Amino acid sequence: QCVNLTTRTQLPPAYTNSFTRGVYYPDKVFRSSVLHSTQDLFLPFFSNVTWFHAIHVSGTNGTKRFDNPVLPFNDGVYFASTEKSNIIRGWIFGTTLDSKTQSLLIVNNATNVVIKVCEFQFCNDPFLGVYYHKNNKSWMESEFRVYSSANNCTFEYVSQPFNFKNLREFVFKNIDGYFKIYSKHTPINLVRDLPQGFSALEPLVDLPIGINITRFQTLLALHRSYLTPGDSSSGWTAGAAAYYVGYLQPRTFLLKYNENGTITDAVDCALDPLSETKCTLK
Amino acid sequence: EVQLQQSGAELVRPGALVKLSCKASGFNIKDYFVHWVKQRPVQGLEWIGWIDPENGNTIYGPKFQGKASLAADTSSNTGYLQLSSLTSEDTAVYYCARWDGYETLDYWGQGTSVTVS
Amino acid sequence: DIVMSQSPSSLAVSVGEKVTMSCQSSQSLLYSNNEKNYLAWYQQKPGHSPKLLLYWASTRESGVPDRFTGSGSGTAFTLTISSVKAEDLAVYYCQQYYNYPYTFGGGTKLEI
Ligand SMILES: *[C@@H]1O[C@H](CO)[C@@H](O[C@@H]2O[C@H](CO)[C@@H](O)[C@H](O)[C@H]2NC(C)=O)[C@H](O)[C@H]1NC(C)=O
Ligand SMILES: *[C@@H]1O[C@H](CO)[C@@H](O[C@@H]2O[C@H](CO)[C@@H](O)[C@H](O)[C@H]2NC(C)=O)[C@H](O)[C@H]1NC(C)=O
Ligand SMILES: *[C@@H]1O[C@H](CO)[C@@H](O)[C@H](O)[C@H]1NC(C)=O
Ligand SMILES: *[C@@H]1O[C@H](CO)[C@@H](O)[C@H](O)[C@H]1NC(C)=O
Ligand SMILES: *[C@@H]1O[C@H](CO)[C@@H](O)[C@H](O)[C@H]1NC(C)=O
Ligand SMILES: *[C@@H]1O[C@H](CO)[C@@H](O)[C@H](O)[C@H]1NC(C)=O
């Protein structure tokens, strides 16, 4: 049972620059002191990435501003989030996000992650509902509150869970019937922007889902310190978490491989003529 | 033991606001929630709502939603209730209560009784 | 909103007699997620501020041991005394904690 959190449909999203982000290891082979050219669905350098702010707005403005819209999935998406206290917890992928078609549910409680692809009738605004208490000063159990019905399940997988301080990055890609996740976790300290630096994502898992993926919606966990059974959707706060979504595109890259096998630099071969001449000169 | 200190009996004119004070010892109001209560022998006792000192906001009941306001300040261990203007319905006994999260009301003061000429 | 009814209105029994009071609700009190019944019971004397008796049917709290024993259902709720005691002149109420407002029952009185 889910009670609609917000009446406002949308707010005008503002975009930031993804400076040299979202580079993932193309293959599982080791290379040292090697400049390597590889073609894949990479995220274009200096692109436009939508900036989402799920934070509590000041009391003068309307009481609710947190946003979790159903966003398109276009040949893979790039996802980042700068947060503390694990506000973001899971994502939902699927075509219609309703009962007739299958969809992928990937939700991660701090101790564990559940990855189920099953027909799901979804709530408009799905959220994991945590509660907190004042006398004990401890944080308590949660309520899932993400789907009304689950039927015809075909794959279950459970594994170890995968200012601002934490910067988590994920790249999702569906190719040839497999769903592949690339991840990287990096402590940072710039509060409101993507860092100016290079980080390489490592292959976490590839799954044999075999489902059509057209749209995805992020899952945020919300906290309220009082619970009554007959009244909900009143008193939820989003804390302070921001997530960023970019879109992948078929592009050619040239990668600098370090002595110890790390990826330290890469070049977009279509940014400008200078980048193209660097890509061809290698 | 927890005990509460409450406004004494009041005799007032209609057509004007009224203020109440509910006091606590042994804890900070931030630690809990605060309910308010008005009681009538005939027509029974009524439930007003809860105010959160930590939130800075308050969720009221619907019967009392009109003609009611709640305020709190942590500097003193005191919570306050006020009404827009005194009607015959408001000419009643009043109580304040403390509500634990995920729980019931646990503390009730001596009370306050409003009689009107 | 939830509405509460109480019975008996008033009953007179000798000290040591067994007495039972029952209050009935028009909606369910069970909450599936916790499987917990959000109901409490109160006892009050004239001119004494109402004080909570232990909720969730676990009525046992500090005081004289097992003063009053209670039983509840999804829609029905009863309180029992195995032997009426002379000191415990009491008036009782039934309240619910499922949705606003927390209902107050019609009241129950016990006379000796
Ligand atoms: C998904 O699971 C439901 C479980 O109810 C299946 O519904 C049953 O379908 C069978 C025939 O396949 C009927 O005999 C039953 O009466 C149905 N049960 C109901 C409607 O409660 C449904 O077929 C499954 N879908 C699949 C396997 O594609
Ligand atoms: C994957 O799902 C999408 C969306 O459901 C499909 O795109 C639709 O396909 C139908 C049938 O061809 C068209 O009528 C629609 O106009 C398409 N777009 C939308 C937004 O519905 C797509 O065909 C599916 N992929 C495969 C391989 O079946
Ligand atoms: C809000 O949720 C209710 C619950 O059933 C639903 O009926 C209603 O359509 C929702 N409001 C929307 C979708 O705007
Ligand atoms: C992103 O698009 C907006 C217009 O929607 C534009 O103003 C902004 O400069 C773009 N960001 C780039 C090109 O980095
Ligand atoms: C995760 O752990 C919780 C207990 O903390 C358990 O209830 C849940 O079923 C687990 N989910 C899995 C299998 O990942
Ligand atoms: C946590 O708070 C609840 C409030 O209902 C209380 O019952 C419980 O004893 C508390 N636990 C601890 C460890 O303080």
Side-chain angles (χ1 to χ4, degrees), chain A residues 131-132 134-135 225-226, chain B residues 30-32 50 54 99 102:
Chain A
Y131 305 61
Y132 169 68
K134 304 201 290 172
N135 289 337
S225 67
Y226 62 89
Chain B
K30 183 180 68 65
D31 308 324
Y32 299 90
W50 58 273
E54 80 180 330
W99 162 52
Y102 327 101

Side-chain angles (χ1 to χ4, degrees), chain B residues 3 10 17-18 27 31 40-41 45 47 58 72 80 86:
Chain B
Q3 273 301 132
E10 315 286 3
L17 80 169
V18 61
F27 68 93
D31 308 324
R40 308 166 297 188
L45 188 147
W47 162 101
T58 166
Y80 316 85
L86 186 57

Side-chain angles (χ1 to χ4, degrees), chain A residues 194-212:
Chain A
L194 274 301
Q196 306 271 5
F198 205 106
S199 288
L201 287 84
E202 290 172 45
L204 192 143
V205 76
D206 57 311
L207 295 174
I209 218 161
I211 85 183
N212 181 354

Side-chain angles (χ1 to χ4, degrees), chain A residues 1-4 124:
Chain A
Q1 158 60 222
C2 324
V3 176
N4 300 305
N124 257 0

Side-chain angles (χ1 to χ4, degrees), chain A residues 235-249:
Chain A
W236 302 98
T237 284
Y243 57 106
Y244 318 79
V245 201
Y247 290 88
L248 302 183
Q249 222 194 34

